[PDB]
Structure 1
């Protein structure tokens, strides 16, 4: 089922002035992976600081880092 890569948008992994703590890899659909968002020691994360991968799609949309 699904389509193309059986993994939630890898884009989330990369974030400007921030690092994502992925935890799933590249398993079928990846209906279990969990990524912990966190902004560098300058900007404070204010949103979906947490997103669980499922059915090749992240539960919550990528957030954003706000300057202190």
Structure 2
């Protein structure tokens, strides 16, 4: 009838020791929104840097940034 859209986890939006970049997506919309991860100028991202919303779930979860 009008079930709420199963938008992907919003938690991913926020990231400690870094910043999350959103593009082509925003409730109540996303059309397979893509997001690029990148930590502060000191920690190098070595994991699920790239992630995209799909079927109410992101392809890759939260990665891990290591201090130089």
TM-score (norm 2): 0.80
TM-score normalised by the chain length of structure 1: 0.80
Structure 1 residue runs of 4 or more that deviate by more than 3 Å after TM superposition: 1-5, 24-31
Q: Structure 2 vs 1, CA of residues 30 and 66 (structure 1 numbering), >3 Å: closer, same or farther?
A: same
Unaligned 5+ runs, structure 2:
none
More strand by share: 1
Mean alpha-carbon deviation: is it higher for 55-64 or for 23-32?
A: 23-32
RMSD: 2.6
**Judging changes above 3 Å, is the alpha-carbon distance between structure 1 residues 2 and 30 closer, same or farther for their aligned structure 2 residues?**
farther
Q: Tell me by how many angstroms 1:25 deviates.
A: 3.4
Q: CA offset at residue 28 of structure 1?
A: 5.9
Q: How many residues matched? A: 68
Q: Please say which structure displays the higher CA radius of gyration.
A: 2
